[PDB]
Design a protein around this ligand. Structure first.
Ligand SMILES: Cc1cc2nc3c(=O)[nH]c(=O)nc-3n(C[C@H](O)[C@H](O)[C@H](O)COP(=O)(O)OP(=O)(O)OC[C@H]3O[C@@H](n4cnc5c(N)ncnc54)[C@H](O)[C@@H]3O)c2cc1C
Ligand SMILES: *[C@@H]1O[C@H](CO)[C@@H](O)[C@H](O)[C@H]1NC(C)=O
Ligand SMILES: *[C@@H]1O[C@H](CO)[C@@H](O)[C@H](O)[C@H]1NC(C)=O
Ligand SMILES: *[C@@H]1O[C@H](CO)[C@@H](O)[C@H](O)[C@H]1NC(C)=O
Ligand SMILES: *[C@@H]1O[C@H](CO)[C@@H](O)[C@H](O)[C@H]1NC(C)=O
Ligand SMILES: *[C@@H]1O[C@H](CO)[C@@H](O)[C@H](O)[C@H]1NC(C)=O
Ligand SMILES: *[C@@H]1O[C@H](CO)[C@@H](O)[C@H](O)[C@H]1NC(C)=O
Ligand SMILES: C[C@H]1OCc2cc(C=O)ccc2O1
Length: 514
């Protein structure tokens, strides 16, 4: 861990090659166009820019416009803030009725997220069947980690929860480790030890400033085709249209996220033939899987209200089993809810410091889809449905996770945070529904599910893409973001998708060097 980032201010040096999409002089030909300045898209664009002329198009603005994105303390503020169409948090509600958010900002979800950093479970690579260059994967993790990842300092709540996971039998003790492994560990964070957020936008500082151009408030509406992708149409904040193209052996990559990538493919006539024909969208490339296999790992939780104040913390201490991944954060109270922290706006608000104690279902096996709400306007959010707990294996895994949270609440570690010194976990004061017979745990899992925010899928490798992230049947078109896999790489996937953007950039540059 010689290589990890130090405490430092958020590096906005890259703003020297960031322009308003209102600038028509950005229109023209590039070697690469990357759609979406987010978790995968920023490192992808930085990496291609080492050798080639790159245009990165981001629909949001720069994070300096929203300073509460740049500190650990600001996390809740960005979710509390009303969505006016400009804000870094975009609010949505799945058709399941569960409140959710996605990013709208240069840096993508790494600018608004909970900062937890992990590398992929090392069994993930073989599970995919992709011929990964594993040495290069690890060099690329170090490239990300040297820029924006730290070893967290001690936080009293994270240390309580770590002792509790160990006492609850989530073994072994892995100490400090970036790796997704069974047991309890301190992992990395993209918040530094002064609370400064570091993010994917900082990876643009690794780009060649003579080769990389970024347009912000660039809403990419259509991929243009020859069958080859040739370019994009994008609109600016004033509503005017702009075109950009790729040249020679160049490519368009879609990095618009689980929601934005399938949406743009569909709008561009890449998607299921009967569905697109039903909307009178001319089919450029029939593929029955665009917007299919869309996943949201369940979050289930209790909230305890200790009788004495607890210090607020960012999540750094993870409890990992194959069937559930658990963490806890401690928070100040609030009178405005952070949107999607609880599954609906109609949720009791805490009046005192509280601990959010959570469990994540792996996979999940339940899936849904993304469909268009507008056949024309990319600023109109698509419909999304996850079908939480439609697969009974997911419900069984939540039962196991909820019993383990019961074990955690029974530990000597957590005993001092009880309101009453009674033998039972009814000694805790709860915000919302306390833990409750498999049927009671089943009801609790179904009724109180929230989003883990780790949604993925909709443009899967093996369905829409080949093992090189190419859209099947289309030249010069790739997708690189969380739309690409039907299972998590680990409990906290930002690390994997930061790595993936640069990795695929390197694979593109290698493919082309021959
Ligand atoms: C609140 C929250 C907390 C999280 N906490 C953690 C955590 O602590 N650790 C962790 O590992 N994971 C966390 N995650 C998940 C993780 O951050 C995401 O899964 C990951 O960042 C997704 O990366 P992506 O590149 O697929 O998407 P994004 O990073 O969202 O990138 C997509 C980008 O495309 C842009 N865009 C979309 N459509 C268009 C268009 N048509 N034209 C132009 N631009 C477009 C978007 O504005 C966005 O910037 C969290 C998620 C959320 C929402
Ligand atoms: C782009 O320019 C317009 C005026 O033409 C302005 O309203 C908008 O804020 C600018 N956006 C950014 C990201 O600078
Ligand atoms: C990659 O690094 C991981 C730890 O994250 C290590 O377990 C593994 O052996 C490394 N693999 C290779 C190919 O070096
Ligand atoms: C598609 O267009 C045809 C006209 O060619 C029309 O009959 C039909 O209603 C249209 N469907 C939609 C959904 O626009
Ligand atoms: C590691 O990933 C594999 C999937 O290939 C999965 O079977 C296993 O449950 C994971 N291990 C942990 C501890 O999450
Ligand atoms: C579009 O979204 C609205 C508002 O959420 C929804 O209720 C409506 O049914 C959707 N329309 C289509 C065509 O999906
Ligand atoms: C759950 O998913 C698994 C594997 O994807 C599959 O075996 C089974 O068909 C699914 N069960 C349900 C209820 O859909
Ligand atoms: C487990 C974790 O999930 C996120 C989270 C956010 C807040 C707001 O600060 C507070 C607590 C919290 O707990």
């Amino acid at each position: 861990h010689h290589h990890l980032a130090n405490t430092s201010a958020h590096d906005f040096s890259y703003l020297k090659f960031v322009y308003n999409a209102t600038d028509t002089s950005l229109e023209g030909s590039y070697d690469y166009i990357v759609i979406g300045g987010g978790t995968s898209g920023c490192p992808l664009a930085a990496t291609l820019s080492e050798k080639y002329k790159v245009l990165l198009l981001e629909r949001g603005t720069i994070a300096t416009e929203y300073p509460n994105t740049l500190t650990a303390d600001g996390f809740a503020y960005n979710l509390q803030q009303q969505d006016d169409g400009k804000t870094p948090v975009e609010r949505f509600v799945s058709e399941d009725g569960i409140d959710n958010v996605r990013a709208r900002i240069l840096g993508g979800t790494t600018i608004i997220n909970a900062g937890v950093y992990a590398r992929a479970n090392i069994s993930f690579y073989s599970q995919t069947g992709i011929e990964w260059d594993l040495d290069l994967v690890n060099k690329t993790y170090e490239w990300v980690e040297d820029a924006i990842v730290v070893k967290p300092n001690n936080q009293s709540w994270q240390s309580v929860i770590g002792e509790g996971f160990l006492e609850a039998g989530i073994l072994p003790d892995n100490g400090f480790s970036l790796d997704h492994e069974a047991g309890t560990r301190l992992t990395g964070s993209t918040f530094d030890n002064n609370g400064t957020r570091h993010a994917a936008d900082e990876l643009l500082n690794k780009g060649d400033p003579n080769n990389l151009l970024v347009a912000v408030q660039a809403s990419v509406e259509k991929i243009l085709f020859s069958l080859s992708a040739i370019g994009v149409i994008y609109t600016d904040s004033d509503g005017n249209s702009h075109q950009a193209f790729v040249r020679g052996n160049g490519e368009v990559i879609v990095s618009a996220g689980t929601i934005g990538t399938p949406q743009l493919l569909l709008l561009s006539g890449v998607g299921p033939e009967s569905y697109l024909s039903s909307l009178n969208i001319t089919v450029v490339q029939p593929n029955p899987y665009v917007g299919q296999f869309v996943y949201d790992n369940p979050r289930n939780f209790i909230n305890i209200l200790p009788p004495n104040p607890i210090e607020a913390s960012v999540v750094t201490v993870l409890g990992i089993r194959s069937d559930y991944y658990q963490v806890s954060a401690s928070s100040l109270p609030f009178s405005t809810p952070p949107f999607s922290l609880f599954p609906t706006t109609s949720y009791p608000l805490p009046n005192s410091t509280f601990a959010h104690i959570v469990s994540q279902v792996p996979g999940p096996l339940s899936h849904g889809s993304v469909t268009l709400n507008s056949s024309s306007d990319v600023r109109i959010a698509p419909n999304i449905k996850f079908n939480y707990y439609s697969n009974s294996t997911d419900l069984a895994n939540c039962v196991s996770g909820m019993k383990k949270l019961g074990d955690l609440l029974r530990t000597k570690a957590l005993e001092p945070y009880k309101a009453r010194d009674v033998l039972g976990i009814d000694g805790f004061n709860y915000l919302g529904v306390p833990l409750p017979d498999d049927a009671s745990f089943e009801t609790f899992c179904l009724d109180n599910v929230a989003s883990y925010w780790h949604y993925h899928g909709g443009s899967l490798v093996g369905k829409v893409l080949d093992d090189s992230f190419r859209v099947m049947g289309i030249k010069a078109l790739r997708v690189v973001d969380a739309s690409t896999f039907p299972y998590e790489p680990n409990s906290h996937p930002q690390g994997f998708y930061l790595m993936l953007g640069r990795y695929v950039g390197l694979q593109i540059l290698q493919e082309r060097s021959i």
